[PDB]
Design a protein around this motif. Sequence first.
Motif, PDB file in Angstrom:
ATOM      1  N   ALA A  74       0.873  -0.822   0.560  1.00 50.90           N
ATOM      2  CA  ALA A  74       0.070  -0.429  -0.062  1.00 50.90           C
ATOM      3  C   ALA A  74       0.712   1.025  -0.111  1.00 50.90           C
ATOM      4  N   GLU A  75       1.681   1.428   1.413  1.00 49.40           N
ATOM      5  CA  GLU A  75       2.707   2.385   1.098  1.00 49.40           C
ATOM      6  C   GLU A  75       3.617   1.983   0.548  1.00 49.40           C
ATOM      7  N   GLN A  76       4.008   1.084   0.478  1.00 51.38           N
ATOM      8  CA  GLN A  76       5.243   0.041   0.031  1.00 51.38           C
ATOM      9  C   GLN A  76       4.951   0.712  -2.008  1.00 51.38           C
ATOM     10  N   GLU A  77       3.304   0.173  -1.928  1.00 49.44           N
ATOM     11  CA  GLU A  77       3.372   0.489  -3.710  1.00 49.44           C
ATOM     12  C   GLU A  77       3.056   2.111  -3.291  1.00 49.44           C
ATOM     13  N   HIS A  78       2.901   2.580  -2.872  1.00 51.53           N
ATOM     14  CA  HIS A  78       2.643   4.304  -3.209  1.00 51.53           C
ATOM     15  C   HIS A  78       4.060   4.735  -2.934  1.00 51.53           C
ATOM     16  N   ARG A  79       4.954   4.519  -2.606  1.00 49.24           N
ATOM     17  CA  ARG A  79       6.164   4.647  -2.589  1.00 49.24           C
ATOM     18  C   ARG A  79       7.152   4.804  -3.960  1.00 49.24           C
ATOM     19  N   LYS A  80       6.864   3.363  -4.625  1.00 44.14           N
ATOM     20  CA  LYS A  80       7.433   2.568  -5.714  1.00 44.14           C
ATOM     21  C   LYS A  80       6.245   3.577  -7.059  1.00 44.14           C
ATOM     22  N   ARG A  81       5.526   3.822  -6.579  1.00 43.34           N
ATOM     23  CA  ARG A  81       4.438   4.931  -7.510  1.00 43.34           C
ATOM     24  C   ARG A  81       5.047   5.757  -7.702  1.00 43.34           C
ATOM     25  N   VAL A  82       5.011   6.765  -6.510  1.00 41.91           N
ATOM     26  CA  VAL A  82       5.425   7.973  -6.804  1.00 41.91           C
ATOM     27  C   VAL A  82       7.370   8.561  -7.026  1.00 41.91           C
ATOM     28  N   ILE A  83       7.779   7.352  -7.100  1.00 42.90           N
ATOM     29  CA  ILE A  83       8.988   7.014  -7.110  1.00 42.90           C
ATOM     30  C   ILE A  83       9.176   7.674  -8.978  1.00 42.90           C
ATOM     31  N   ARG A  84       8.360   6.463  -9.365  1.00 44.45           N
ATOM     32  CA  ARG A  84       7.991   5.978 -10.719  1.00 44.45           C
ATOM     33  C   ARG A  84       7.712   7.555 -11.500  1.00 44.45           C
ATOM     34  N   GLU A  85       6.713   8.237 -10.992  1.00 44.91           N
ATOM     35  CA  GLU A  85       6.047   9.707 -11.619  1.00 44.91           C
ATOM     36  C   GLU A  85       7.287  10.378 -11.485  1.00 44.91           C
ATOM     37  N   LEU A  86       7.906  10.941 -10.674  1.00 45.14           N
ATOM     38  CA  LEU A  86       9.031  11.500 -10.244  1.00 45.14           C
ATOM     39  C   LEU A  86      10.278  11.108 -11.411  1.00 45.14           C
ATOM     40  N   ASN A  87      10.094   9.935 -11.285  1.00 44.41           N
ATOM     41  CA  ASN A  87      11.032  10.154 -12.487  1.00 44.41           C
ATOM     42  C   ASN A  87      10.888  10.008 -13.622  1.00 44.41           C
ATOM     43  N   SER A  88       9.729   9.622 -14.218  1.00 44.05           N
ATOM     44  CA  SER A  88       9.453  10.337 -15.395  1.00 44.05           C
ATOM     45  C   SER A  88       9.313  11.803 -16.000  1.00 44.05           C
ATOM     46  N   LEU A  89       8.776  12.549 -14.837  1.00 42.00           N
ATOM     47  CA  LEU A  89       8.913  14.007 -15.465  1.00 42.00           C
ATOM     48  C   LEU A  89      10.497  13.987 -15.465  1.00 42.00           C
ATOM     49  N   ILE A  90      11.084  13.608 -14.841  1.00 43.67           N
ATOM     50  CA  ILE A  90      12.863  13.734 -14.658  1.00 43.67           C
ATOM     51  C   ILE A  90      13.557  13.341 -16.924  1.00 43.67           C
ATOM     52  N   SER A  91      12.333  12.881 -16.753  1.00 48.12           N
ATOM     53  CA  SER A  91      12.982  11.664 -17.827  1.00 48.12           C
ATOM     54  C   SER A  91      12.228  11.858 -19.315  1.00 48.12           C
ATOM     55  N   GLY A  92      11.836  12.948 -19.443  1.00 44.18           N
ATOM     56  CA  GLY A  92      12.503  14.069 -19.350  1.00 44.18           C
ATOM     57  C   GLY A  92      11.455  15.644 -19.875  1.00 44.18           C
TER      58      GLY A  92
END
Length: 189
Positions: A74-92
């Motif tokens: 849940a919160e593990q799932e969520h950290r994984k989710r925001v990480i990839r969202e923050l990644n994808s916005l970064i790249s680019g």
Amino acid sequence: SSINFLTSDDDASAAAMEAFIEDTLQQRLQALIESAGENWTYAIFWQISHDFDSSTGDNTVILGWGDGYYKGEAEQEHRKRVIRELNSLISGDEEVTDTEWFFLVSMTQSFVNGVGLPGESFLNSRVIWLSGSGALTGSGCERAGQGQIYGLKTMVCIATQNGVVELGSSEVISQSSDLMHKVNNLFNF
Ligand SMILES: [Ca+2]
Ligand SMILES: [Ca+2]
């Protein structure tokens, strides 16, 4: 901000792939569902390309991410989710819901003509309208199945000249006579 910024043109699928591990389609997609009287969650446009299989042929038609627009409603799932969202916005921060996530991960997907809901739809120049959870899980299509897991209850693929328009919703939606004509105006010419 809204996720509608990560979708357009960057060869977005490449971005999405490494993250996850004619125009403007978008505005037309946006008009489509904004211009509609059922609560659609998103529209995506699958565009045609050609591959060339190794060691044989092969003029193989392939559907891939063109663009898409995401309305929404849940919160593990969520950290994984925001990480990839923050990644994808970064790249680019803000929560990443099931439908938002399905919308994003779709950017990584492609379909051999004739295969899956988008490929079946394009191959046969077909409207495939799946309404209700059992319609999605009974479809034999893994994208429809995946959509259902993420809360969708309606998923639609409509063949158009350049590709396939996909609509999805977390609601059970019947096919509107008006919504079909809008797809004509916006996607055939
Ligand atoms: Ca594109
Ligand atoms: Ca879950």
